[PDB]
Design a protein around this ligand. Structure first.
Ligand SMILES: NCc1ccc(N)nc1
Ligand SMILES: NCc1ccc(N)nc1
Lengths: 134, 134
């Protein structure tokens, strides 16, 4: 019943049930937690991963309404470092290695799952069904 | 500092920042509240209002992750009645009259605002900008 600090980062563009379940899972890794959520910057996301619909301000403002989210770092650093974990006193990083090998060697890696098919892009397809024909 | 029970209902299809701000506003109408959120059924919504993308189960499961939501009635009745307020001991109904005249006569109506332009349908337009040309 000591409080465990969990860090989860991501883009969190067009937040959907998949993101929410993953956040829920991080929050509940232990009985008593503080879930810190990192939100990646627009430039770094675009340069290193892919396009983003929503600004950093929009993606962060949305996460503020999520029950599981206790603290937000926005923008977060694109790569997690041992110094960053010390600075914010982070006990574990939650993510669904090569990059993460050092986190697992330190015992600070907690896996979470993805929920496929519940995404924002998947919803528009359902709207189209009422039409897609000849 | 006595606890005030607030009821807000709606479709909550493809939940977005607009819905979240409105829920936040209901939750914070008084210092100490229980926010009950009613989620309208698929059939009644379709018959009386318009199309819906997500099932009742999907719309309800999403609201479960929202910080401001304390209790959910799913499905909720399509029309609020004085008997329903008694049954769930509801002090105020929060909504953004003809229909609601009786609620205001009873002192049980609290207005909230809408946030236009932050909707799910408005996000797809931004994606299209990268293309819309000749
Ligand atoms: N969603 C991918 C990703 C990339 C970098 C980072 N720091 N976090 C997440
Ligand atoms: N969103 C409109 C609406 C219709 C009926 C009801 N009970 N609540 C909301």
């Amino acid at each position: 019943s000591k409080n465990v600090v969990i860090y989860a980062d991501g883009v969190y563009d067009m937040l959907h049930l998949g993101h929410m379940k993953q956040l829920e899972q991080a929050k509940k890794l232990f009985e008593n937690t503080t879930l810190i959520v990192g939100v990646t910057s627009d430039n770094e996301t675009k340069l290193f991963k892919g396009q983003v619909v929503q600004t950093l301000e929009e993606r962060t403002e949305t996460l503020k309404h999520i029950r599981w989210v206790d603290e937000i770092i926005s923008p977060c650093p694109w790569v997690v470092t041992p110094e960053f974990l010390e600075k914010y006193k982070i006990d574990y990083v939650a993510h669904d290695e090569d990059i993460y090998a050092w986190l697992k060697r330190a015992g600070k890696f907690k896996a979470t799952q993805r929920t496929e098919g519940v995404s924002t892009t998947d919803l528009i397809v359902r709207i189209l069904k009422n039409y897609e024909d000849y």
